[PDB]
Write an enzyme that holds these catalytic residues in place. Sequence first.
Site, PDB file in Angstrom:
ATOM      1  N   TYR A  22       0.818  -1.225   0.000  1.00 14.70           N
ATOM      2  CA  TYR A  22       0.000   0.000   0.000  1.00 14.70           C
ATOM      3  C   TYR A  22       0.847   1.268   0.000  1.00 14.70           C
ATOM      4  CZ  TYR A  22       0.561  -1.694   4.890  1.00 14.70           C
ATOM      5  OH  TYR A  22       1.042  -2.254   6.049  1.00 14.70           O
ATOM      6  N   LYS A  49       8.264   1.820  19.162  1.00 15.66           N
ATOM      7  CA  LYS A  49       7.741   2.928  19.973  1.00 15.66           C
ATOM      8  C   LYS A  49       6.414   2.580  20.658  1.00 15.66           C
ATOM      9  CE  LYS A  49       9.268   7.557  18.980  1.00 15.66           C
ATOM     10  NZ  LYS A  49       8.985   8.011  20.354  1.00 15.66           N
ATOM     11  N   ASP A  86      14.285   4.816  20.921  1.00 17.34           N
ATOM     12  CA  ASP A  86      15.023   5.946  21.472  1.00 17.34           C
ATOM     13  C   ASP A  86      16.257   5.501  22.233  1.00 17.34           C
ATOM     14  OD1 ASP A  86      13.205   8.319  20.808  1.00 17.34           O
ATOM     15  OD2 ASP A  86      11.809   6.883  21.746  1.00 17.34           O
ATOM     16  N   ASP A 115      15.547   3.974   8.979  1.00 15.62           N
ATOM     17  CA  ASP A 115      16.357   4.896   8.183  1.00 15.62           C
ATOM     18  C   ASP A 115      17.226   5.784   9.044  1.00 15.62           C
ATOM     19  OD1 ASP A 115      16.038   4.150   5.470  1.00 15.62           O
ATOM     20  OD2 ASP A 115      14.021   5.073   5.449  1.00 15.62           O
ATOM     21  N   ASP A 139      21.231   5.791   9.419  1.00 12.52           N
ATOM     22  CA  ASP A 139      21.957   7.054   9.296  1.00 12.52           C
ATOM     23  C   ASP A 139      22.966   7.233  10.415  1.00 12.52           C
ATOM     24  OD1 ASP A 139      20.498   7.809   6.986  1.00 12.52           O
ATOM     25  OD2 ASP A 139      18.847   8.497   8.295  1.00 12.52           O
TER      26      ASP A 139
END
Lengths: 333, 333, 333, 333
Positions: free
Chosen positions: B124, B170, B203, B227, B231
């Site tokens: 989707y 999360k 986190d 991502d 990074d």
Amino acid sequence: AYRICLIEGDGIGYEVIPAARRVLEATGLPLEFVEAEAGWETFERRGTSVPEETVVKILSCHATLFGAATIPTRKVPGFFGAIMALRRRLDLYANVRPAKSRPVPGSRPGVDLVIVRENTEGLYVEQERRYLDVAIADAVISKKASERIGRAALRIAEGRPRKTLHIAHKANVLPLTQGLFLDTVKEVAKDFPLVNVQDIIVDNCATQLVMRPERYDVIVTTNLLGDILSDLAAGLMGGLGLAPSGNIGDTTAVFEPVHGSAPDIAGKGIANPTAAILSAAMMLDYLGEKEAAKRVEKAVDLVLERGPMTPDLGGDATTEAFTEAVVEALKSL
Amino acid sequence: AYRICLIEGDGIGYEVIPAARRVLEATGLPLEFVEAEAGWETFERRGTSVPEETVVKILSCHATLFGAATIPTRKVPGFFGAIMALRRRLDLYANVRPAKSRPVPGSRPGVDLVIVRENTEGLYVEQERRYLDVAIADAVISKKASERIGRAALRIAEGRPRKTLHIAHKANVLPLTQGLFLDTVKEVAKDFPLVNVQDIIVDNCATQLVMRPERYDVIVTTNLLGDILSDLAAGLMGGLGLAPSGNIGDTTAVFEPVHGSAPDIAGKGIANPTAAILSAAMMLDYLGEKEAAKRVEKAVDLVLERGPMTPDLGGDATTEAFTEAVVEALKSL
Amino acid sequence: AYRICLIEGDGIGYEVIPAARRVLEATGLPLEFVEAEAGWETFERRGTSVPEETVVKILSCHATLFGAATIPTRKVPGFFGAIMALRRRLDLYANVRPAKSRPVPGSRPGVDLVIVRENTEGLYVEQERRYLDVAIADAVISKKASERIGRAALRIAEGRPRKTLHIAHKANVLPLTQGLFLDTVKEVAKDFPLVNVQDIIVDNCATQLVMRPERYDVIVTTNLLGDILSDLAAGLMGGLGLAPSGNIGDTTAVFEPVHGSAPDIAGKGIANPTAAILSAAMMLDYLGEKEAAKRVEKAVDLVLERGPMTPDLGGDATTEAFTEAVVEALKSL
Amino acid sequence: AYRICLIEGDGIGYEVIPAARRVLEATGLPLEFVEAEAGWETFERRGTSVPEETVVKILSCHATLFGAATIPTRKVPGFFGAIMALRRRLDLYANVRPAKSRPVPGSRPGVDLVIVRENTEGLYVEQERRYLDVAIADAVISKKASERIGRAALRIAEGRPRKTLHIAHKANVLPLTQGLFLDTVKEVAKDFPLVNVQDIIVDNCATQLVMRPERYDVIVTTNLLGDILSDLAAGLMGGLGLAPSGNIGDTTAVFEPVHGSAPDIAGKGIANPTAAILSAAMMLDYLGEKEAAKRVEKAVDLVLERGPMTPDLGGDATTEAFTEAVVEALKSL
């Protein structure tokens, strides 16, 4: 006289807030302390996590210093989340998280940055839904919300030596939401011609926070995102346990350490008060006592340098000893 | 014999892909290379970025090795939604991004991890709306999507020495979406009793990747989170220059360097082929040629350690000299 | 023996439910009546609108016959979300609303139809959000929900002489949601080759219900659309006074008049029991007692035609006189 | 002089628009006709369903009269929906649908009502999404949108003899979206003290539109909802084939019959021009020629009363004969 509301919260807050109170007293400033309560234990006694009294006290003060609250992770009780009703009333939209070099193990030197992201609570709750085997969570950007957060980050930037703001966004893949945030902050930036404003894909910003964190002054970003960047930043500083924070509205402000209530080591007297005292320093800065806030920070830096060490820093000295060490180091400055 | 689709793409693609081809051929393996074209320079020649011949070729091969596509500076002319149709049709839902210490400058030692998160397009398009001054982007989690990405990460983890997977989520603040992801990956994890599965708030994961990246092996997470974690991890490696990547579906896979087409240096013979070669190695591993894959990685590491050094590594050597050294090193490994 | 749960509810419930009970008993069928309490007057007595005893009783019975609940004028005190928990737990997803010509004034002749649409609560709460000055309500269609509501409508249609179902939809303007509903009902319709299945734009359906209601038998539609179609249909009947209804799940069903508790006339002995009696008839049909159900409908029609006439029908007769006439008429039918 | 843009569209528009043109000419009013094109056949020739020329012509006119467009129901071609780009430019937010008694078979007497609902196109597209087996469509209410539609319905109400407006809502079950609409219209109603303003649950309004339609003057409602109410209303009027409509913005307006292009009977010359002429009457009213608009309406009523009849009305006379009959009946008045 400056009216300061003190709310210890839960667990290690009973230790770090009185510690910060003493350091504040050691500045000699005309301070009046108004005591209030909030958190998990408060809820157990009042039926509410934030009593009306607490809300009144905060509003009658210039600023508020908060410890930490115990978050129920085993469950969610019958609306202990009355803190969300307070978050709306206060509308402290600007979350502010400094990440600055300290003389501790595994700390990168030359770092002095500030990350700004919005709290939406005062405007709206971003809602989640689950329909059968599909769940959707809204990420919401409004123009109004982006105007004020941008403006707040710009004020932060303007009152700092380097006058630099990076807008960290994802408008390359989210052109409607992140693009609206990018554009709006850039519009308000025109009202701050003294500030150098740069934009950056948040992916590039994350890499550079690891490789060259000293390149940033102030960073403004959206939520979910600031936190992740702040958490990476805290990684350079020797963890989240030394980190100060504030939440800032148009009328008042709450400053608080980033750490939790830590019920593990609660009532033992070894929890590091650093992050709380540094939060109180942030508070003095916000209030206008900038030179006084600078003095508290050096007083803290001197003790991270010239002892003693708490269990989190690789020692076994107490919370109380750390405080009076900071207090007396402040007498010097 | 393995059929391998070779797509050079744009810019330095014409230099780094042939280099990878040569390293592959140096193994002696039975490999049939099928050349195909795609990217910006292809769009200029053909009116489409992904010609039908190329789609047929990708589907007729066991795997595809790709260089890089030049992204147009402004508007999508244009355009290429032929790349977007490809994405949908192929359903290469497993983005695979290794981050491993190299013997180069600015590369932090002791890191050896893989970040896995889903590409959604085969299922989707996650939609954005703007209604007046309010913009909303959907973040979508489904059980079906979480099941396969978890399973794919677990298969990666299982084929590795440490047998360790962390699920970075999360669920503490997004219990419906992130909780669905968390709960589902843990269910499939019951099919992998040899793998040690831990969960972690994304986190805290970020702080740890900075402080203690050596404790992580495979990390599975949701898209946008992965991502940023890649990074950060790239920050530890000193950038994206050496990073390989893969996108894997149920019947095939496309491997490619993380880096772009770097068009301003194309034809100059100074592009570093490391990341293309390491992507070919990922491909070999994927095809069931693990020992040859490790041999290739070893050849690369030796040359990174003892020269020739291309300009990105602080030397003046050419693509060609670097490629020949890898080819020669391989034979003795 | 059939276990029947009798819930009077509020206001005229105490008059119309006993009346229905008497009509049921007049059939001679083996019926065990289990009395339970629910509604506003129950909340005042108990602190909950649906006591646990009542839930247990509903679950222990083949079907439940309910009167009506008084809705509080303003705020939900309160409140009753005990009714909302019941809805979730029971998953009575099939709302069934017959509209049939009666021999009374203002009732249009030649109408004989059933409108079917889903109650969603057993699957998901369809959520609303407000973000500043923009409010959004979700309209949710799922394949699972469409499958069962279609199947339920088709079972209704199959048990009826005309063997006709129309699917009323908005797929012309909402092709993703309404199209999913349309396509799914048509798939299940393949399991019912004896039923004639037509589709129709809900808008055209409404015009036709006014002009030519006689061509429709069973109509299946989505929620919010059904309600307006039932309202129109009630307009043809001269109002809601005589309308029966059912909410049917996979293991039980609750039948009740469409009308409210009409508290200002409670105790006056002038409430018309037609709709409660006709709901008891729907119940008999549901339990597999079709012939007795038709006998009950016939008794009602005869009395509606030839008196006694309660005040709502333009006469001065009592609830009691009307009930005794239905009881007597039944024996000869 | 009044500048009138005429766009025939597709199919039966080639017959009904020239018919309306002649009736307009027969009023003697200073009219200037500017011809433009739009629709399905236009798209087949220009590559666009609305050429730039058409858009310019509309903007240079006081008002526009439109036939009907052929809607592709077998498919959707390569953006024939360039009409949506025009809908945004024009922002004709107020959809206006009169339902008034006519002397035709199956027509209720004493009915003279007007239903108003917004077109959102000028502000936003309400979006649908489908994620796996779940589809969600947004129903969007904004304050801005509710202010202007409310104000437009109030202006309509104020210039009518009875000065009555009903707000038909669903705020009983949609308190955030429908409640925002209810409240906002009630706020602007204070600016119109000469108008009697009532609110009604749309479910009650539907029933009363069947039972006593003569009780309403102007009804204001949200979208999906007006249409259903208008369709029920048209049921009292002998169908949708006699119905006029207009779409009204702040600067201009488009008036059009409610019927489709009807390619079945296109080019045969029997399609009833009534709805088009009545739309042109609406247009004269909007322009300020209220007495002139009244004259056209009687001229139409006289021909529905004193012949001839077209195939839709139960006859076999032509489109052309009907027109000149109306034209000459207008000469009388």
